[model samples]
Target chain A: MAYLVAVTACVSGVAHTYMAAERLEKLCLLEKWGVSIETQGALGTENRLADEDIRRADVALLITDIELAGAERFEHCRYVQCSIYAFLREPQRVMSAVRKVLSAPQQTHLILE
Target chain B: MAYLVAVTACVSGVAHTYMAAERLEKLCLLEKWGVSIETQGALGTENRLADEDIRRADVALLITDIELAGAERFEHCRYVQCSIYAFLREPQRVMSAVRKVLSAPQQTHLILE
Candidate 1:
C-alpha cells in the first residue's frame, strides 16, 4: 500500500491542511494506494514519515508554503511542491501525474503521505 | 451543537494541526460536545470559522506557535492558547475547563471553531 507520501500544509494549519489530508486519504484508500501524510503545524510535527516508509515510497507531496522540517531527507526522492488549494482542487490530477512519473519515469511529482 | 470553535496550527501546518483536529473531534463527538476546529497552514487559512459560529461559541481553542489570523475576533471571547501536543495529550482537560468556564462565569475560556 506504500506508494506516495505527502506533507499537507496551509497558512494556519487549522483547516486546509486537514482538508487536503482527509481528501487525499479518501482518494488513496479508494484507489487502494498505500500513502501517508505528515502535518507540521503550530506545535511542531506529527505522523512523520518513517525512514523505511520513505525508502519504499516513489514520490513525496509537499503541500506547503513555508520550508519543511527534515526536508533534506527527501532530497534524493522524487518530490513535488504544491499549494493545499491546488491539491484540494485537483488531488486526483496530482496523483495521476505522479502515477505517470513513477510508471513512465518521464513525468514529475512528489509529496509526503 | 455549536459550543466551541478552535484554530489549530503548528510550525508547519502539515501534520500536527490535523492530528489535533482529528483527536479533538473524536473526543468532542464521543462526549457529544459540539466543537469546530480551523487549520491555518503555510498556504494560508482554511476552515475559517464563521461569525455566527464564533458568536454562538463559549470558548475558542487557538492551538499554535505562530500568530493566528483574525485573532482579533477571539479577543472578544475567552480563548486559550495551546500546543497541538498539549491538546492531543489533554484535549478533555482543555474542553472540560472550558466547559467549566462557560458553565460558570466564575471561570473563563474561548476558541473560534
Candidate 2:
C-alpha cells in the first residue's frame, strides 16, 4: 500500500519529536495512508528514512522546529513543511488543507488572457 | 531479541490507535528496549499480536480509550492498561515507571490485566 513519510524533530529533538510524529501517524492511519516516522533528536535519527520509503510516499511531511537531517533526500516527491507545534496540534486539518492545495487542479489554467 | 508488545485502540479504532503505538515505540527505541505494537482499527489489525510476541515481552502495554479486543492474550506477560491519551502524552515516563512496577514482586501486581 502506498504510504506517506513523516519526519519530526524539535530544537532539542526529544519531547516534541515523538509528539508530532505520533500525532501525524495517527491521522494518516485514520485516512488509511500507510506511514512511518523518522525522528531526529540527540539520539540522532531513529528509523532513518529510506530511499524507497520516500519513493513510496504520496507526500513527505517534514515537521520540525528547526533544520533536519537528510532534508535533500526528499526531493523525489512533493513535501510539506511546518512547525512542530503546528503539526502536533492541527495535523489532520493541515493535511486536509495541504492535500486540497496540492491535489486540486491549477487555479491558473492555460488560457489566452 | 526480547521486546515489548503494545495493543492500541480507540473508539473508532483509528487515530489514537497508531498514535499511542508509535509513541511507545519511539520511547522504547530510545531506551534500547525493543517494542512491537498491534494496532486495531477500521483496518482491523495491521500487526497482529503473536503468542511469542507476548511471551517474549518485558511488558505488555494496552493503551485504549475504550474496552479493547483480545485483552486476554496478554496473560503471558504482565500487562499495563491506561488511556490512549496517557500513552500519547507521557510515554517515556509511563515506560520507565512501568519498568519499576514490573520489577517488584508478583502478588502486588498479580491482578495481571
Candidate 3:
C-alpha cells in the first residue's frame, strides 16, 4: 500500500476542483501509488476521505483556492499548501513537491496514518 | 448585475471546492449581489464561466491552492489570489477581501469584462 491524500477548495465552484482531482488521480494511478481525494462542493460534500483512508495516507496535498476557516482539522497530517489552479496546470509538479517533502530524510514527522 | 468569478484546483478532489462555492453563492445571494462561479473538477469541467458572465463581471476571485502554469487567461480580469481552504472556512471573509480590492481607489486596473 502506498498512501492516501486529499484536496479541497471553494473557488470556481466544481469545474477546476474536479479537473484537478482527475489530473492528480491520473498521475497517481500512472505512478502506481495509492491515494484518495475528497471534495466539498455546492451540491454538498463529495468523495470524502475515509478514516481508514486518512490512516493509510502518508501525506496530504491541500490545494485550496479560497479562504477556509478551520485549520484544526488538518493539524494531524503533513501537508503542503498551494493553489487549485497550480494543481490544474502542473499536477506532476504538485506531486513532486509533496513527494519531496515526504522523501526528506531530516523531517521524521508522523501522522496517525 | 455585479460580477462573475471562476475557481479551479487539483487537491482533495472536489469536496471543499464545491463547499466553498456553495458558501460564496449563499453569501452573494443573501447580500443581493450578482455573481457566478465555474469549477473544474475530477469528472471534467463543471459550471464553466460563460463569455457574457465574464464580460459583465466587475472583478474576479482566483482561489487556487496549487501552482498554475499559464496565467494568461486570467490577465483579462481584475483578480485576487488566495487559498481554496480559506474560502471554505471563511467565505464571507474571502468576499470581503475581494470586495476590498474592488473598492480600492488608488489602483485603477480594468479588465475587458
Off by over 4 Å in 1: A106-113, B1-113
Cα lDDT of model 3 by residue, A10-109, tens digit: 6567786787777778778887778888786665568777766665577777777775434345545555566786677666666665665466432212
**Given candidate 2, what's the lDDT at residue A17?**
86
Encode model 3's per-residue lDDT on B20-105: one tens digit a residue: 67777877787677777766556545777766776677777766675533444564565656677666665665566566546643
What local lDDT does model 2 show for residue A96?
60
Better structure of 1 and 3 per TM-score? 1
Best by lDDT: 1
Cα error, residue A48 of model 1, in Å, equals 0.8
Q: Give the Å shift of residue B60 in candidate 3.
A: 34
Better of 2 and 3 by TM-score: 2
Q: After superposition, how far is residue B73 of candidate 1 from its true place, in Å?
A: 42
Clashes of each: 58, 0, 64
The lDDT values for all models are: 0.70, 0.66, 0.61
By summed lDDT, which 10 consecutive residues of candidate 2 chain A come out lowest?
Answer: A104-113
